[PDB]
Design a binder for this molecule. Structure first.
Ligand SMILES: COc1cc(-c2nn(C(C)C)c3ncnc(N)c23)ccc1NC(=O)OC(C)(C)C
Ligand SMILES: [Ca+2]
Ligand SMILES: [Ca+2]
Ligand SMILES: [Cl-]
Length: 435
């Protein structure tokens, strides 16, 4: 008899899902992925619930100060986000010491500004926890309560648990292929050589984005084969692919990203006010996405600012990945790909380097004043874009390393992500050691 508890409020919008408040306890009848079958102890109704809205009773995830599956860098992004303050803290699973927990706290110093510091919580052998050997606790709550009443060697006294947001509600069960009737395409956002992008609505309840592919040479059968591969590339830094309409003209359904393209965003009022370490954080998120793609042995083929999407909370997401294998931007293209049509993860690295320049120049066109063929002649001479005023010297070396003539001499996304994530932090300073 498994009993779980709700971490957030949820309001049913489908036929057989259940509504509940945060705190409600439910009996698990069937575990089966994103949707579970349960019975609400408050209403006695049987139905479906999102598995990621609940957790077993009195387990760690029930606690407000606990955060599951958060990397050290995710913790720092989450803590430095609005609504938090000094002593804002979180306990989370260790990224480097698997099976163990780490503590992250919001801090300040005038030389650097607001920061996040990290402490490793060492699990005892008796079953206790400590950051400092001088001080040991029986429960993580005991740990928390203590450092909440005084610094006792930390950088800050613990104030309030980090801000959390409700996760995305999962897509309807077994609704991969959908009939056009489910969609109301309410506003066109973009139109191009190959189709349009629309802000839409799925069954009156969910906001989505729809990509309408004009019936090109694109084999229906061959597209959908690749779409089923794309469906398996689920990562927080790639746009969420929800569904598909199977008859020409083919429709593609993704999550809606409120702030549209990174290119348009950088060129807006709010974009123009982003400081440089924010621009660098964007870069790092994108590198994270590409490292995942690299990991899975995949190729993007069209990396640039216009194919990156921005969420309302400024999370960056890679879009249009691999879509070009199925179906201009030579200024983003590596020579081996231009001359010989050779497309690799290495040629993407070249593209990422150009995107970096796009980002740091707030969206400015690459090789300005130059035409495409002018640009081609220049490269084969050894020309490279110069360093703009605001770009730091070490950021520039990364771009330059991205623009090596020989593909093999280009670094990996794994390495790039790692550099960019800790651009302002020395390796020795990642964690804190307290006596
Ligand atoms: C609905 O599908 C998309 C929508 C957008 C998109 N563009 N815009 C603006 C810039 C026109 C958006 N605004 C908000 N949300 C979006 N998903 C988009 C981008 C890309 C796609 N498609 C897409 O990336 O295709 C894959 C996932 C199969 C590789
Ligand atoms: Ca490896
Ligand atoms: Ca250290
Ligand atoms: Cl019961």
């Amino acid at each position: 008899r498994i009993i779980v508890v709700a971490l957030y409020d949820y309001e049913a919008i489908h036929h057989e899902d259940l509504s509940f408040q945060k705190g409600d306890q439910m009996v698990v009848l069937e575990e089966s992925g994103e949707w579970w079958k349960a019975r609400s102890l408050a209403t006695r109704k049987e139905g479906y619930i999102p598995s990621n809205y609940v957790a077993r009773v009195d387990s760690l995830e029930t606690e407000e100060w606990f955060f599951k599956g958060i990397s050290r860098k995710d913790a720092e992004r989450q803590l430095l986000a609005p609504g938090n303050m000094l002593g804002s803290f979180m306990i989370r699973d260790s990224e480097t010491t698997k099976g163990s927990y780490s503590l992250s706290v919001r801090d300040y110093d005038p030389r650097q500004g607001d920061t996040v510091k990290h402490y490793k919580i060492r699990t005892l052998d008796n079953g206790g926890f400590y950051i400092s050997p001088r001080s040991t606790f029986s429960t993580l709550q005991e740990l928390v309560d203590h450092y909440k009443k005084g610094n006792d060697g930390l950088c800050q006294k613990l104030s309030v648990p980090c801000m959390s947001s409700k996760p995305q509600k999962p897509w309807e069960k077994d609704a991969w292929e959908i009939p056009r009737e489910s969609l109301k395409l309410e506003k066109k956002l973009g139109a191009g050589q190959f189709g349009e992008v629309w802000m839409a609505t799925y069954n009156k309840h969910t906001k989505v984005a729809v990509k309408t592919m004009k019936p090109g040479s694109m084999s229906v059968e061959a597209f959908l084969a690749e779409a089923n591969v794309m469906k398996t590339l689920q990562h927080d830094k790639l746009v969420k692919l929800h569904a598909v309409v199977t008859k020409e003209p083919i429709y593609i359904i993704t999550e809606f990203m409120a702030k549209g393209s990174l290119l348009d965003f950088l060129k807006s009022d709010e974009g123009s006010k982003q400081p440089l370490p924010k621009l660098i954080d964007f870069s790092a998120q994108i590198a994270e996405g590409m490292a995942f793609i690299e990991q899975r042995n995949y190729i993007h083929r069209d990396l640039r600012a216009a194919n990156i999407l921005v969420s309302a909370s400024l999370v960056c997401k890679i879009a249009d990945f691999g879509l070009a294998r199925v179906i201009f931007p030579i200024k983003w293209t590596a020579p081996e790909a231009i001359n010989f049509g050779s497309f690799t993860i290495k040629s993407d690295v070249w593209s990422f380097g150009i995107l970096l320049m796009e980002i740091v120049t707030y969206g400015r066109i690459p090789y300005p004043g130059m035409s495409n063929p002018e640009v081609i002649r220049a490269l084969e001479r050894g020309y490279r874009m110069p360093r703009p005023e605001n770009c730091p010297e070490e950021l520039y070396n990364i771009m330059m390393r991205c623009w090596k003539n020989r593909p093999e001499e280009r670094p990996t996304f794994e390495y790039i992500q790692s550099v960019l994530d800790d651009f302002y932090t020395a390796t020795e300073s990642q964690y804190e050691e307290i006596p």
